Design an enzyme around this catalytic site. Sequence first.
Site, PDB file in Angstrom:
ATOM      1  N   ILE A 248       0.769  13.261   9.403  1.00 20.54           N
ATOM      2  CA  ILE A 248       0.824  13.169  10.860  1.00 20.54           C
ATOM      3  C   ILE A 248       1.352  11.824  11.364  1.00 20.54           C
ATOM      4  O   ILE A 248       1.829  11.739  12.493  1.00 20.54           O
ATOM      5  CB  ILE A 248      -0.530  13.529  11.539  1.00 20.54           C
ATOM      6  N   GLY A 249       1.302  10.790  10.520  1.00 24.18           N
ATOM      7  CA  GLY A 249       1.635   9.425  10.938  1.00 24.18           C
ATOM      8  C   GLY A 249       2.414   8.622   9.913  1.00 24.18           C
ATOM      9  O   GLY A 249       2.296   8.865   8.704  1.00 24.18           O
ATOM     10  N   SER A 250       3.207   7.660  10.413  1.00 25.89           N
ATOM     11  CA  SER A 250       4.060   6.776   9.587  1.00 25.89           C
ATOM     12  C   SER A 250       4.468   5.482  10.306  1.00 25.89           C
ATOM     13  O   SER A 250       4.736   5.483  11.513  1.00 25.89           O
ATOM     14  CB  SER A 250       5.326   7.512   9.109  1.00 25.89           C
TER      15      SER A 250
ATOM     16  N   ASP B  18      -2.884  -6.067  23.157  1.00 25.39           N
ATOM     17  CA  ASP B  18      -1.785  -5.260  22.661  1.00 25.39           C
ATOM     18  C   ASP B  18      -1.937  -3.743  22.740  1.00 25.39           C
ATOM     19  O   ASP B  18      -1.485  -3.029  21.838  1.00 25.39           O
ATOM     20  CB  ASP B  18      -1.449  -5.650  21.233  1.00 25.39           C
TER      21      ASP B  18
ATOM     22  N   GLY C 181      -0.312   1.533   7.119  1.00 19.77           N
ATOM     23  CA  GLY C 181      -0.754   2.924   7.350  1.00 19.77           C
ATOM     24  C   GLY C 181       0.227   4.109   7.485  1.00 19.77           C
ATOM     25  O   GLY C 181       1.043   4.184   8.421  1.00 19.77           O
ATOM     26  N   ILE C 182       0.114   5.033   6.527  1.00 20.55           N
ATOM     27  CA  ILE C 182       0.664   6.384   6.601  1.00 20.55           C
ATOM     28  C   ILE C 182      -0.545   7.198   6.964  1.00 20.55           C
ATOM     29  O   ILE C 182      -1.657   6.863   6.508  1.00 20.55           O
ATOM     30  CB  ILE C 182       1.157   6.890   5.202  1.00 20.55           C
ATOM     31  N   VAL C 183      -0.382   8.235   7.784  1.00 16.66           N
ATOM     32  CA  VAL C 183      -1.574   8.990   8.223  1.00 16.66           C
ATOM     33  C   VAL C 183      -1.444  10.506   7.961  1.00 16.66           C
ATOM     34  O   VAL C 183      -0.420  11.094   8.251  1.00 16.66           O
ATOM     35  CB  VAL C 183      -1.972   8.728   9.753  1.00 16.66           C
TER      36      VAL C 183
ATOM     37  N   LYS D  41      -5.979   7.632   6.729  1.00 20.52           N
ATOM     38  CA  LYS D  41      -4.964   6.595   6.713  1.00 20.52           C
ATOM     39  C   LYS D  41      -5.099   5.668   5.493  1.00 20.52           C
ATOM     40  O   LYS D  41      -6.207   5.166   5.161  1.00 20.52           O
ATOM     41  CB  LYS D  41      -4.964   5.812   8.016  1.00 20.52           C
TER      42      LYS D  41
HETATM   43  C1  LIG Z   1      -3.717  12.902  15.946  1.00 22.77           C
HETATM   44  O1  LIG Z   1      -4.825  12.264  15.296  1.00 22.77           O
HETATM   45  C2  LIG Z   1      -4.673  10.983  14.833  1.00 22.77           C
HETATM   46  C3  LIG Z   1      -3.399  10.415  14.691  1.00 22.77           C
HETATM   47  C4  LIG Z   1      -3.280   9.105  14.230  1.00 22.77           C
HETATM   48  C5  LIG Z   1      -4.423   8.367  13.927  1.00 22.77           C
HETATM   49  C6  LIG Z   1      -5.688   8.931  14.068  1.00 22.77           C
HETATM   50  C7  LIG Z   1      -5.800  10.244  14.525  1.00 22.77           C
HETATM   51 CL1  LIG Z   1      -7.419  10.970  14.715  1.00 22.77          CL
HETATM   52  C8  LIG Z   1      -4.250   6.973  13.435  1.00 22.77           C
HETATM   53  C9  LIG Z   1      -5.363   6.245  12.716  1.00 22.77           C
HETATM   54  C10 LIG Z   1      -5.658   4.919  12.998  1.00 22.77           C
HETATM   55  C11 LIG Z   1      -6.696   4.241  12.353  1.00 22.77           C
HETATM   56  C12 LIG Z   1      -7.420   4.911  11.382  1.00 22.77           C
HETATM   57  C13 LIG Z   1      -7.123   6.239  11.079  1.00 22.77           C
HETATM   58 BR1  LIG Z   1      -8.094   7.167   9.750  1.00 22.77          BR
HETATM   59  C14 LIG Z   1      -6.109   6.906  11.752  1.00 22.77           C
HETATM   60  N1  LIG Z   1      -3.116   6.441  13.617  1.00 22.77           N
HETATM   61  C15 LIG Z   1      -1.969   6.979  14.352  1.00 22.77           C
HETATM   62  C16 LIG Z   1      -1.912   8.478  14.076  1.00 22.77           C
END
Ligand SMILES: COc1cc2c(cc1Cl)C(c1cccc(Br)c1)=NCC2
EC number: 2.7.11.24
Length: 348
Positions: free
Chosen positions: A25-27, A142, A29-31, A46
């Site tokens: 879901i994320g890039s 920020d 931290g990769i998530v 993450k």
């Molecule tokens: C759509 O749900 C998310 C999407 C992201 C994140 C957390 C969540 Cl719950 C985080 C994130 C940030 C800190 C810790 C953790 Br584990 C996850 N970062 C951006 C993408």
Amino acid sequence: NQFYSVEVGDSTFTVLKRYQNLKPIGSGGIVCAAYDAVLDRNVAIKKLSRPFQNQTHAKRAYRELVLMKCVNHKNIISLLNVFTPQKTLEEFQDVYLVMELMDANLCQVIQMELDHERMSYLLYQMLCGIKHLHSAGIIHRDLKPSNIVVKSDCTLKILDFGLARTSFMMTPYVVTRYYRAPEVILGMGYKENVDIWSVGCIMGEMVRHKILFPGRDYIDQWNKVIEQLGTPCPEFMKKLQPTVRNYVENRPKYAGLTFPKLFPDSLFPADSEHNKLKASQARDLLSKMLVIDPAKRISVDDALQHPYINVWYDPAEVEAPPPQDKQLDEREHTIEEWKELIYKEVMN
Ligand SMILES: COc1cc2c(cc1Cl)C(c1cccc(Br)c1)=NCC2
């Protein structure tokens, strides 16, 4: 072995067997999204890779690990789990963070058209998070929509804790600067309402569906700021370093557009009397947040009492307890040293 590994994009995720079905879901931290068999619910995972690799990565990873603990509010991130698959300090490489899964980031939500109810509820929650942070001695500095997440039911959480006391990184990823207060841009001292600025930027992007103050760097960005809000007045300049003050007084000078101009009726639901009133109220709040001089910018406590915001007001959510390191933020270490500081925090 309590762990297993899987390729998620071009990342290996080595996680506890309880977490199944990792979808990225994320890039940057990769998530990932995963299902937690133990808790019978969905979670975000993450991965921090070698977070001790430099001072910047390390200061942030460490700080946010510890700041997690002395913070407890429904509008701020809280972890369900923290682990490392590596078995010793010597072998240590990665930290994985686990939280309850949410539905969208605030970037995606800004792209939508939202009624005043959802829009003002989001904004109320941002203020509650920021208030809790401030009460614990954390001035974010920020805030940006990419680090804010929402559930379908409009509940909201802030995911990071901002800046500390910089700061070079050999990566190709860019830092988003557009939500930073003038006082951050212009290297001033700051106070709590530095974070109010970031909120107005977000509120404004929600209306405009367009980043308010864009730029390659602070030069372009500052131009974007004065050409919409107008040159700040004499007493603002007087609190600037003599070198910064010179440059700011020598930019092309602006009157600045009015807030009806910056944000016309057309951008707002304004089809009933209710919405006509909420439009005026929204614009009035924006006009008090998007103020260059922090001496005249609205406080968090005043924004919470704003008509646009106060319909949600809850003592439980606003006057929530401020708990709970110290020389955190001012500490300076080597790789070896940050590795152990981090390992200790991951293992308790
Ligand atoms: C759509 O749900 C998310 C999407 C992201 C994140 C957390 C969540 Cl719950 C985080 C994130 C940030 C800190 C810790 C953790 Br584990 C996850 N970062 C951006 C993408």
